[PDB]
Amino acid sequence: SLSAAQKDNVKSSWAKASAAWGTAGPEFFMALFDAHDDVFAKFSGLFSGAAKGTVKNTPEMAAQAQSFKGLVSNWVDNLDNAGALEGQCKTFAANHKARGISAGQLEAAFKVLAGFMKSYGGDEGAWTAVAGALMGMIRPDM
Ligand code: HEM
Ligand SMILES: [C-]#N
């Protein structure tokens, strides 16, 4: 369910997106928010009530893009290490469950990411496989 080649593509394309994430991360979040208004709703405290169409170039968005990246980098650096991946997922799940966030909203974010990553050489099928592996760890904890 997760080949060596898929992992390699995810790592390498993540390196490319990560290098560009100071501009690309805000764009990914806007794609996420435009596809899933309920995802944007959970950020209404961070963005202090602001409308979606205003948030891209805020300091909060720059911080959030950094937060998201740091965890995806940790996952993608450990794709042969189920135990390390589980440990990171457990923390992530607990934090997002405590916000009232569902497993399906996390899955939506992974689906938006998998397509977004096509611009960085990503194989959407590889990002789908990695997301499926992570969701299998996450779901029991949501
Ligand atoms: C799959 C992807 C995701 C990754 C990698 C990701 C990662 C992170 C990390 C590392 C943090 C900072 C640690 C913490 O407080 O938990 C964070 C914070 C947060 N995430 Fe996520 N997250 C994901 C999906 C989502 C989704 C789908 C939502 C909303 C429906 C969301 C809502 C939030 C909120 C509201 C914060 C706190 C913002 C704040 O400081 O006020 N996350 N996420
Ligand atoms: C969470 N971003």
UniProtKB/Swiss-Prot annotation:
Annotated GO MF terms: heme binding; metal ion binding; oxygen binding
Pfam families named in the record: Globin (PF00042)
Coiled-coil portions: none
Location(s) in or outside the cell: Cytoplasm
PROSITE patterns tied to this protein: GLOBIN
GO BP term, example: oxygen transport
Domain of life: Eukaryota
InterPro entries registered for this protein in UniProt: Erythrocruorin (IPR002336), Globin (IPR000971), Globin-like_sf (IPR009050), Globin/Proto (IPR012292), Mb-like_M (IPR044399)
UniProt KW keywords: Acetylation, Cytoplasm, Heme, Iron, Metal-binding, Transport
Domain Globin: 2-142
Main location: cytoplasm
UniProt keyword Heme present: yes
Gene Ontology cellular component terms for the protein in this record: extracellular region; hemoglobin complex
Residues annotated to bind heme b: H96
Role, per record: Serves to transport hydrogen sulfide to autotrophic bacteria.
Subunit details: Monomer.
Note: This molluscan globin lacks one of the heme-binding histidine residues found in most other globins.
The family this protein is said to belong to: Belongs to the globin family.
Protein known as: Hemoglobin-1
Originating organism: Phacoides pectinatus
